[PDB]
Amino acid sequence: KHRVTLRKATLASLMQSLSGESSNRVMWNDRYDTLLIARDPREIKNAIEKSVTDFGGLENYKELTGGADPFALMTPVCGLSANNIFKLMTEKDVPIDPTSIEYLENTSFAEHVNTLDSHKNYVVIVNDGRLGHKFLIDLPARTAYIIQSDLGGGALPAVRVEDWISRRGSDPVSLDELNQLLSKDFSKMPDDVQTRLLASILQIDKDPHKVDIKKLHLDGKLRFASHEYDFRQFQRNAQYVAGL
């Protein structure tokens, strides 16, 4: 099969489009209760204009809101990226709210993968309380891939989703290594084991030195949720966003 080649092309063409106004806005809107592909680039733009008008103009909006021009192309934080890309992959005609879906708390990653169906595609959304980090694990029909973004500030360095995708988005990651990360046990692992796993799974250069386990919240809660997806449908949804 040629799923991986197509997946790479699909993710590529999608990422390239994101420097385009309408594509960026539809991709990284944070309303999760309607179909992502139903997001209208002019509706969103009107909403921003309105919001700015309400704050007495752009100058004043920026002054009160931190300095951000809300018209600018967005570099998504990890939650916004994970949520939206999850939406894009799983949605057909029924809105999926990734913030409202049920998450698993008392089952390990190995437990769950073993129960998933073999000829089906799944994407897993991970909320890692130890890293303070959301990211996706893609499981096409075993082999896994990481989709993520990161503004930094925690154990891991900043990484734009575009860069991550381009350099590591098709980099198969070990299920085995993945289980060791996604485990209550991970918190009490030696500094170098932790560092090594983080770099290996989540750092763009596989580099221990860019990781800082002193920023881990060791009493963190690990939660994740998986969802089946139609691969062709994922391509559909991606093509739509890229085509704006």
DSSP the chain: --HHHHHHHHHHHHHHHTTSHHHHHHHH----SS-GGG--HHHHHHHHHHHHHHTTSHHHHHHHHTS--TTSPP---HHHHHHHHHHHHH-SSS---TTTS--B-SS-HHHHHHHS-TTSEEEEEEEETTTTEEEEEEE----BEEE--B--SSSSPPB-HHHHHHHHTT--B-HHHHHHHSSGGGGGS-HHHHHHHHHHHH-TT--GGG--GGG--TTPPEEEEEEEE-HHHHHHHHHHHHT-
Cβ contacts of 63 within 8 Å, gap of 6 or more:
none
| CA–CA separation, 79 and 58 (whole Å) | 26
Cβ atoms of residues 110 and 179 within 8 Å: yes
| CA–CA separation, 141 and 124 (whole Å) | 13
Catalytic residues: 78, 133, 148
Tell me the CA end-to-end span of the chain in Å, nearest whole number. 30
Cβ atoms of residues 222 and 184 within 8 Å: yes
Q: Is 211 exposed, middle or buried (0-12, 13-18, 19+ CB in 10 A)?
A: buried
Cβ contacts of 41 within 8 Å, gap of 6 or more:
21, 22, 25, 26, 244
The packing angle between helices 78-90 and 21-28, to 10°, is 90
Tokens 């944070």, residue located: 30
PDB resolution in Å: 2.6
Shortest CA distance to 223 belongs to which of 180, 174, 184, 197?
A: 184
Shortest CA distance to 71 belongs to which of 39, 48, 41?
A: 48
Task: Write down the domain spans for the chain.
Answer: 2-65+77-244
Q: Under the phi-then-psi rule, with left for phi > 0, alpha for psi from -120 to 50, and beta for the rest, what region is 26?
A: alpha
Q: Where is the chain broken, named by the residue before each break, C–N > 2.5 Å?
A: 141
Tokens of 195: 């560092």
Half-sphere CA count of 95, side-chain side, radius 13 A: 11
